Amino acid sequence: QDLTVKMTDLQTGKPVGTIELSQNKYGVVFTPELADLTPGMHGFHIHQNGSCASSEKDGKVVLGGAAGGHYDPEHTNKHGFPWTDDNHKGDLPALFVSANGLATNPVLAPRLTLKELKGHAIMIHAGGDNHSDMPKALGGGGARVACGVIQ
Amino acid sequence: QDLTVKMTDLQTGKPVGTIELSQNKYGVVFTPELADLTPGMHGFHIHQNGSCASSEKDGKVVLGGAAGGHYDPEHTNKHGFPWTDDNHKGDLPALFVSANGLATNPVLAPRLTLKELKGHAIMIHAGGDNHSDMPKALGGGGARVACGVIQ
Ligand SMILES: [Cu+2]
Ligand SMILES: [Cu+2]
Numbered sequence: 346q347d348l349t350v351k352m353t354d355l356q357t358g359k360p361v362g363t364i365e366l367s368q369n370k371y372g373v374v375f376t377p378e379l380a381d382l383t384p385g386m387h388g389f390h391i392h393q394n395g396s397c398a399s400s401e402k403d404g405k406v407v408l409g410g411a412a413g414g415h416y417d418p419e420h421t422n423k424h425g426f427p428w429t430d431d432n433h434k435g436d437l438p439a440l441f442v443s444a445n446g447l448a449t450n451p452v453l454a455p456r457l458t459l460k461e462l463k464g465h466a467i468m469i470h471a472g473g474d475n476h477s478d479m480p481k482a483l484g485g486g487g488a489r490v491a492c493g494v495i496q
Numbered sequence: 497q498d499l500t501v502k503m504t505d506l507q508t509g510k511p512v513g514t515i516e517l518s519q520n521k522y523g524v525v526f527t528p529e530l531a532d533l534t535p536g537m538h539g540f541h542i543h544q545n546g547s548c549a550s551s552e553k554d555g556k557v558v559l560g561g562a563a564g565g566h567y568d569p570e571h572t573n574k575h576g577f578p579w580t581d582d583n584h585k586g587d588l589p590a591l592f593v594s595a596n597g598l599a600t601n602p603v604l605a606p607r608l609t610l611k612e613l614k615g616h617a618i619m620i621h622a623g624g625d626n627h628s629d630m631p632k633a634l635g636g637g638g639a640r641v642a643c644g645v646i647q
């Protein structure tokens with residue numbers, strides 16, 4: 346059995362679709378069926394905490410902030426590619442959103458297992474992801490726009 | 497060492513960029529640096545023959561036709577996902593082209609080895625790729641728009 350995760354828009358709070366997670370011999374496949382997102386490539390990662398709630402810093406609200414940082418069980422403390430080991434295991438390939446706001450292209454994360462995903466959050470960012478902390482920390486994804494908690 | 501492949505637009509014959517091929521523990525990474533392509537997702541596959549020349553059928557010219565069909569050394573005779581074994585080993589993840597005609601997002605083909613790629617062609621299609629022969633044969637990629645021969 347695969348897993349289905351419901352995704353929610355952090356600004357309006359409305360649902361934007363689902364992501365199907367599937368265990369394959371080469372890793373976990375993420376098949377999205379999302380709508381209402383801005384066209385373009387978006388940073389897509391697994392975050393530490395199983396929460397999509399916001400958090401605060403200096404009295405400012407941070408949407409999706411409760412999810413914490415990137416899933417990084419080996420304590421690499423660095424952002425990278427989905428196919429490099431010295432970086433966050435939660436680093437997924439960027440998610441493509443078409444001109445009409447639809448996300449339907451599946452991507453593979455070869456370092457992950459479906460089992461370990463439970464209890465973490467799937468996050469989609471405003472910006473893209475160049476898979477590096479240079480020139481922008483965490484791939485330049487920026488704000489969190491949509492989030493979902495796995496299982 | 498990685499491999500660099502030069503890509504050429506089949507209609508005008510001009511170069512559109514390069515693709516860097518790299519062997520990784522999880523498969524081969526294709527990092528494109530292309531321009532002048534139509535925005536959207538494009539079918540992206542490895543074809544049998546090491547040629548980007550055209551071919552003819554019923555006296556009609558078929559651009560890129562000399563490359564033959566999809567690389568399929570196990571004779572599966574079916575189009576599928578980059579992470580399923582019962583289909584063409586030349587089936588790569590779809591290539592994303594931004595609003596400005598640039599392709600710079602890397603993708604991983606976990607079933608391939610850099611070694612076996614030599615002598616085949618990399619092809620980009622007009623249409624997309626749903627990784628199935630349904631409802632359209634070969635994922636609905638259609639015409640061949642850009643092509644390059646590996647090594
Ligand atoms: Cu993130
Ligand atoms: Cu093809």
Ligand SMILES: [Zn+2]
Nearest residue numbers: 415424433436
């Ligand atoms: Zn990361």
Ligand SMILES: [Zn+2]
Nearest residue numbers: 566575584587
């Ligand atoms: Zn195929």
